RNA sequence: GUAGACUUGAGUGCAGGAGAGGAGAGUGGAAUUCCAUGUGUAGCGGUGAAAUGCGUAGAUAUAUGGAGGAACACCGGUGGC
């Protein structure tokens, strides 16, 4: 007896960090009910950005998107990593309708100093 | 040294351009972090890994606007000043 929706063109916010990756599926502006990460699953160690583990991370919330009931995907990828690519082909092949893989990695212009030497 | 001469060195004229040359007076965007904020769940961190820790007071992440400082990637180069 809880409030539910049937959206179709969700917006798939997936952030591949350089250690992990969230895999999220979003509303029209939006907000995510069907969403996860790699690190949601207990792959904590050297297994934090294995790309087939990222494939299943880009599969689990992907199949959880049909709780809402969406099939076409409005993909948005941010950030690179060491597990990004099989996640990319994963949600390109995750029972979905890949048409628009967005690339929204934000760019400074000699901005703030990063933390130092190593 | 003394008187003398000329430009043929220097500089001053008339024409050109050039630059991150200085010093002030302002403006713009990206980006970071933070104020609320959609609405959802443990996450994120880091490495060879984690304890560090923060965080369920339920958030990061994602939707927005605001705030502020910093600095201004290709331009940019054995380039110039």
């Amino acid at each position: 007896r809880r409030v539910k929706k049937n959206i179709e063109s969700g917006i798939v916010h997936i952030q591949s960090t350089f250690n992990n990756t969230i895999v999220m599926i979003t509303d029209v502006h939006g907000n995510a009910l069907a969403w996860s990460s790699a690190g949601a699953l207990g792959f904590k160690g050297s297994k934090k950005s294995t790309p087939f583990a990222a494939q299943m991370a880009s599969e689990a919330a992907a199949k959880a998107a049909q709780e809402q009931g969406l099939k076409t995907v409005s993909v948005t990828v941010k950030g690179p990593g060491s597990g990004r690519e099989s996640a990319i082909r994963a949600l390109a092949a995750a029972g979905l309708n890949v048409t628009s893989i967005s690339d929204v990695t934000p760019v400074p212009h000699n901005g703030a100093r990063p933390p130092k030497r190593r």
Side-chain angles (χ1 to χ4, degrees):
Chain A
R1 291 180 184 268
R2 295 279 79 80
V3 178
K4 61 176 71 177
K5 293 177 183 177
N6 193 2
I7 201 167
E8 178 62 29
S9 65
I11 303 174
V12 190
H13 292 82
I14 293 175
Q15 166 69 46
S16 178
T17 75
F18 295 96
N19 285 315
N20 286 315
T21 296
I22 53 95
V23 176
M24 297 181 70
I25 297 164
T26 319
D27 290 330
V28 64
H29 53 284
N31 205 331
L33 284 74
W35 69 272
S36 179
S37 74
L41 292 171
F43 291 94
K44 188 172 172 66
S46 66
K47 51 187 178 180
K48 287 173 71 176
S49 289
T50 303
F52 289 166
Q55 172 175 3
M56 289 173 281
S58 297
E59 186 268 333
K63 270 72 178 176
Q66 283 76 16
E67 191 271 332
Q68 293 174 351
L70 64 95
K71 302 299 185 294
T72 186
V73 288
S74 302
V75 176
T76 168
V77 178
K78 192 167 93 278
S82 68
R84 59 178 181 177
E85 295 180 356
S86 297
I88 288 164
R89 191 181 62 82
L91 90 158
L96 302 179
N97 293 320
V98 50
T99 58
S100 64
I101 296 169
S102 181
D103 298 326
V104 288
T105 299
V107 178
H109 310 299
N110 297 325
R113 290 182 179 178
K116 283 154 64 174
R117 180 81 269 276
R118 64 184 184 273

